[PDB]
Structure formats: structure tokens, C-alpha cells
Design a protein around this motif. Structure first.
Motif, PDB file in Angstrom:
ATOM      1  N   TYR A 170       2.912   1.564  -3.163  1.00  0.00           N
ATOM      2  CA  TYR A 170       2.019   2.049  -4.208  1.00  0.00           C
ATOM      3  C   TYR A 170       1.913   3.568  -4.155  1.00  0.00           C
ATOM      4  O   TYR A 170       2.190   4.253  -5.140  1.00  0.00           O
ATOM      5  N   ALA A 171       1.589   4.092  -2.978  1.00  0.00           N
ATOM      6  CA  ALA A 171       1.378   5.522  -2.821  1.00  0.00           C
ATOM      7  C   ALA A 171       2.686   6.280  -2.965  1.00  0.00           C
ATOM      8  O   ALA A 171       2.830   7.112  -3.854  1.00  0.00           O
ATOM      9  N   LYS A 219      -8.308  -1.601  -7.149  1.00  0.00           N
ATOM     10  CA  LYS A 219      -8.979  -0.640  -6.272  1.00  0.00           C
ATOM     11  C   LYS A 219      -8.041   0.509  -5.927  1.00  0.00           C
ATOM     12  O   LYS A 219      -8.410   1.681  -6.029  1.00  0.00           O
ATOM     13  N   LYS A 220      -6.825   0.160  -5.522  1.00  0.00           N
ATOM     14  CA  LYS A 220      -5.780   1.148  -5.320  1.00  0.00           C
ATOM     15  C   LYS A 220      -5.745   2.110  -6.494  1.00  0.00           C
ATOM     16  O   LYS A 220      -5.786   3.325  -6.312  1.00  0.00           O
ATOM     17  N   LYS A 253      -4.955  -4.364  -6.225  1.00  0.00           N
ATOM     18  CA  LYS A 253      -4.244  -3.274  -6.886  1.00  0.00           C
ATOM     19  C   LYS A 253      -5.184  -2.423  -7.731  1.00  0.00           C
ATOM     20  O   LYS A 253      -4.997  -1.211  -7.847  1.00  0.00           O
ATOM     21  N   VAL A 302      -6.663  -4.834  -0.180  1.00  0.00           N
ATOM     22  CA  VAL A 302      -7.261  -4.010  -1.219  1.00  0.00           C
ATOM     23  C   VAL A 302      -6.546  -4.252  -2.548  1.00  0.00           C
ATOM     24  O   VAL A 302      -5.396  -3.845  -2.727  1.00  0.00           O
ATOM     25  N   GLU A 316      -9.905   2.142   3.198  1.00  0.00           N
ATOM     26  CA  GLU A 316     -10.553   1.147   2.360  1.00  0.00           C
ATOM     27  C   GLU A 316     -10.397  -0.237   2.976  1.00  0.00           C
ATOM     28  O   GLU A 316     -11.254  -1.104   2.811  1.00  0.00           O
ATOM     29  N   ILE A 343      -6.502   4.565   0.732  1.00  0.00           N
ATOM     30  CA  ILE A 343      -6.309   3.144   0.506  1.00  0.00           C
ATOM     31  C   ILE A 343      -6.452   2.370   1.810  1.00  0.00           C
ATOM     32  O   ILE A 343      -7.035   1.286   1.843  1.00  0.00           O
ATOM     33  N   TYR A 344      -5.966   2.960   2.896  1.00  0.00           N
ATOM     34  CA  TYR A 344      -5.874   2.259   4.171  1.00  0.00           C
ATOM     35  C   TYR A 344      -7.197   2.229   4.929  1.00  0.00           C
ATOM     36  O   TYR A 344      -7.511   1.239   5.592  1.00  0.00           O
ATOM     37  N   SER A 385       0.817  -1.209   0.000  1.00  0.00           N
ATOM     38  CA  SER A 385       0.000   0.000   0.000  1.00  0.00           C
ATOM     39  C   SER A 385       0.856   1.266   0.000  1.00  0.00           C
ATOM     40  O   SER A 385       0.636   2.173  -0.805  1.00  0.00           O
ATOM     41  N   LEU A 401      -3.911   9.631  -0.819  1.00  0.00           N
ATOM     42  CA  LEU A 401      -4.014   8.291  -1.381  1.00  0.00           C
ATOM     43  C   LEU A 401      -3.695   7.216  -0.349  1.00  0.00           C
ATOM     44  O   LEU A 401      -4.489   6.298  -0.135  1.00  0.00           O
TER      45      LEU A 401
END
Ligand SMILES: CC(=C=CC=C=C(C)CC/C=C(\C)CCC=C(C)C)CC/C=C(\C)CCC=C(C)C
Length: 279
Positions: free
Chosen positions: A24-25, A267-268, A265, A263, A245, A242-243, A21, A238
Motif C-alpha cells: 500500500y505505502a 483506514k490505510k 484498507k 488495519v 495503527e 499504518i503499522y 501494508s 505512511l
């Protein structure tokens, strides 16, 4: 590819390994800022997992760096990270004290006893994550005031709280419960029991009561996102979005205690779009 680069890329590997996560961000930052974040994550990751001779080594390396930033050190712990961090520390301002808190907090976990009160739980949350948010603050903000550190802390603490919430079963398996004795008793929940027999109304309510604290803390940070530099805002939005979520994920899994929810990828990517789209 210089040598620093290889150090940073190891740092990066660690972060992407352990937090799909945040990678990603935070991989969406400028190069300078995203490297710094790699180094700090890695150091922290290294301490969290460190478990006890290693942990003192890591503390000693960090004290070195803090005392004499511009000397060569023969790092006792992981040299790849300490160089990456030392490199950061030369250009940016590192809240060394916050590393020492996290380290302190991680000691105390070798003799983890259950928290009496939410107060103790929120205080663990600080040591474990509030500290991280402070360390990151100078990186993600042009000018660091008290309310900059405040927000990032609050975000840190809430994300850790969302951790606990996702991880309830896994944590039980490892002989750990993070819900507080006072709140368990008040809500009439035996975590051992729920683990055997599935969820019930009393669990959901306790779980939902903490969830409420997190969502509320998240909202409180969103409405102050401005304290962070302009490139970092949507990144931090973000990461947080995401978190949170993660919370709806746990709900759809019916608060299961027998798997880590995630979650996906896609959705991310969906959320990066929603957030990106209004910047
Ligand atoms: C894993 C994950 C997260 C993990 C941890 C987090 C935290 C510790 C947040 C708080 C900590 C902070 C601010 C700093 C970090 C350093 C320390 C606390 C020492 C989400 C992404 C999913 C992954 C990587 C796959 C897992 C599998 C599933 C979701 C099926």
C-alpha cells in the motif's frame, strides 16, 4: 513488458501477497524506487520463508551478485528475484552485509531457544528487520550518512517489534514465544496459560511495556524523517503510521491471542490523507 518487468512484477506480487501494508505505502513511490523496493522485499521474504538447501542457494546467488555484478549468473535459487536484485545492484548501492546478517539470523532460528533478555530479543529484531531497513536506505535517501542507516534500522526494528505484538497467539501456536524469559518472569506471565484462559492484567502490562518501546521508537524516527529523500518521506511516514495503527487494533481486539488483527484498507486510505494533507 520487457523481461526485467516480468521479474519485478513477480517481486511485486510477492510483496503485495505478504504485506498489504508495505505494498500500500511503497507502491506510491516513483517507478525506479518502488521497483528496487520490490526486489529487496522479495529477496528478504524469500529468505524468511526459505525454511535448508534453498537458503544456502540464496546466499550463494547473493555472493555472486556482490562479487561480479555485471556478469550473467545461473542462479541456484529463484532466478526471477535474483535478476531483479542484480538489476538494482547495477544502479544502486546494496548493503550486502545486511543480507548476510538476516541470513545468519534465519539459520539460528532452526534451533530457536527463548531469549534470556530483552537484549537478545532486540538483537533478533535487528537481524530480522533492522537489516532490511539498512538495505533499503540507499534507495530511499539521496545521500546516505550514518544517521540515515541508523534511523531506518530503528524503524525496521520497531516494526518487527510491532509484528511480535500482533502475532502473539499465532506465534505461540507455532511453538514460538518472542517475549523474553526475564520480562515474562518479572511480569509473571505464562503465555501458554493466557492462550488457554484469555488475557489478564499481567499480560496487558507486559504487552503494554513493549508497545511503549515501539511507540517511542516510532516517534524518534518521525522526528528524523528528514534523512530520507523528499518523495520517500510521506511514504515512510505512511508505512510507519499504518503499522503503529496496528497497535490500537490489538487493543480494540482486547489483546486477543486467537486472530491476526488488521488495519482495513479504508483506514490505510484515511491515514494517507492525514499525512498527505500536510505535505
Ligand atoms: C501482514 C503484514 C505484515 C507482515 C510482515 C511484516 C514484517 C515482517 C515487518 C518487518 C519486516 C521488514 C521490515 C521486511 C520484510 C521482510 C522480512 C522481515 C524478511 C501487514 C499487512 C497485512 C497483511 C499482508 C495481511 C495479514 C493479515 C491481517 C493483518 C489480518
Amino acid at each position: 513488458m520487457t523481461m526485467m518487468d516480468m521479474n519485478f512484477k513477480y517481486c511485486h506480487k510477492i510483496m503485495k501477497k505478504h504485506s498489504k501494508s508495505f505494498s500500500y505505502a511503497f507502491d506510491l513511490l516513483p517507478e525506479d524506487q518502488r521497483k528496487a523496493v520490490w526486489a529487496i522485499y522479495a529477496v528478504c521474504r524469500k529468505i524468511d520463508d526459505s525454511i535448508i538447501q534453498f537458503l544456502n542457494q540464496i546466499k550463494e546467488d547473493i555472493q555472486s551478485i556482490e562479487k561480479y555484478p555485471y556478469e550473467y549468473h545461473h542462479f541456484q535459487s529463484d532466478r526471477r528475484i535474483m535478476m531483479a536484485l542484480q538489476h538494482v545492484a547495477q544502479h544502486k548501492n546494496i548493503a550486502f552485509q545486511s543480507f548476510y546478517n538476516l541470513i545468519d539470523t534465519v539459520y539460528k532460528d532452526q534451533h530457536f531457544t527463548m531469549f534470556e533478555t530483552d537484549a537478545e530479543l532486540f538483537g533478533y529484531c535487528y537481524g530480522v528487520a533492522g537489516t532490511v531497513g539498512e538495505v533499503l536506505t540507499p534507495i530511499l535517501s539521496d545521500h546516505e550518512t550514518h544517521q540515515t542507516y541508523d534511523v531506518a534500522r530503528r524503524l525496521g526494528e520497531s516494526l518487527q517489534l510491532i509484528n511480535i505484538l500482533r502475532d502473539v497467539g499465532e506465534d505461540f501456536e507455532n511453538e514460538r514465544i518472542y517475549f523474553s524469559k526475564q520480562r515474562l518472569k518479572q511480569y509473571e506471565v505464562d503465555i501458554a496459560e493466557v492462550y488457554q484462559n484469555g488475557v489478564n492484567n499481567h499480560y496487558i502490562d507486559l504487552w503494554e511495556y513493549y508497545a511503549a518501546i515501539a511507540e517511542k521508537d516510532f516517534r524518534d524516527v518521525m522526528d528524523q524523517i528528514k534523512v530520507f529523500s523528499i518523495e520517500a518521506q510521506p511514504i515512510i511516514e505512511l508505512a510507519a503510521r499504518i503499522y503503529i495503527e496496528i497497535l490500537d487494533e490489538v487493543r480494540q481486539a482486547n489483546y486477543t491471542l486467537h486472530e491476526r488483527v488488521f488495519v482495513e484498507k479504508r483506514k490505510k486510505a484515511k491515514l494517507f490523507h492525514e499525512i498527505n494533507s500536510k505535505y
